[PDB]
Design a protein around this ligand. Sequence first.
Ligand SMILES: O=C(Nc1ccc(OC(F)(F)F)cc1)N1CCC(Cc2cnc3ccccc3c2)CC1
Length: 336
Amino acid sequence: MDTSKLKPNDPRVKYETKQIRGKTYSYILGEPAGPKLETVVLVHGWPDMAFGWRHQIPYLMSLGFQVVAPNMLGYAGTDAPRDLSQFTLKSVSADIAELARSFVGQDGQIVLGGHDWGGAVVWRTAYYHPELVKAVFSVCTPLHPLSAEYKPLEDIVAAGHMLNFKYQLQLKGPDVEARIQGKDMLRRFFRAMFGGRGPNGEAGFSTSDGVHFDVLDKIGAPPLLDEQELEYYVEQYALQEAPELRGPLNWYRTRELNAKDEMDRAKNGPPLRFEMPALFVAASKDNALPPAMSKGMDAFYKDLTRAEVDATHWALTQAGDEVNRVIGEWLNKALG
Ligand SMILES: O=C(Nc1ccc(OC(F)(F)F)cc1)N1CCC(Cc2cnc3ccccc3c2)CC1
């Protein structure tokens, strides 16, 4: 089988829509070679897309897995409700359960794979729905404990803490949504997000000030995306209603919301415990989420697998041939 990465609107996959929990959920369906072992749900992050697994989906299809990878809430052909409560990691965990059970049955079981914000989803979905996650893994994103207190992110960086998150302030703010609308800003925006730099090495994104709008006129075509996926990321992001990034940025506007759900579970609900197999693929140059943040991840697992790729936050495509190698071998022994 052709195990190369997925090309834009690749014929080796199905582009299907399925209504779940009130919204339309676009997804890609990558189907196995021969009789499937399992079904795998792949979850991207910000500002990624189901297409962000181009190196993984065909590889997992070639391993005999049925692969579904949905565009999440706010991204591409999936709906973006106005309700902030729909972008909480809980409700979206409830989404992934319904989309899974839409494919393997209510008693079925799934190998869950997420990354970035989707990396935080698949742990939540493994926490909320352990009836279903036979094996869960996350790339770049390590487990964060259930939130017990809510602090506005402004107050946390005002005391010098969590400065690696100071970009969500502006992101959650009106700036990125108001300034990046239409194919033209989105295109330059994606040059920025995927490693673009300007004539004097200005970066379109930094973890402290987020999107830099003054550089994005000057920023070149990206090292981690050819022209056709950059134009595929923009053709697909234009699917959302202007301002097209309300949904994609909405994943950052739910700090207090997720707090209320997890303060509930940190006090009443069960503790953060994973008794199903788990892989964690850290990316070395993930300037967004450093591999030190993984820290005391392992004290929450019966059987956790550690891994690390010398790569940026965009580990699915940069280190894709090394990531596919890592997930495959872990999947092979985790399921036996
Ligand atoms: O913003 C994120 N990723 C990202 C950042 C910058 C990017 O631009 C580029 F990297 F390309 F330059 C691209 C993606 N997140 C991904 C992981 C989420 C999981 C999470 C949730 N809550 C937490 C609460 C307390 C402690 C840790 C927590 C971690 C956070 C947001």
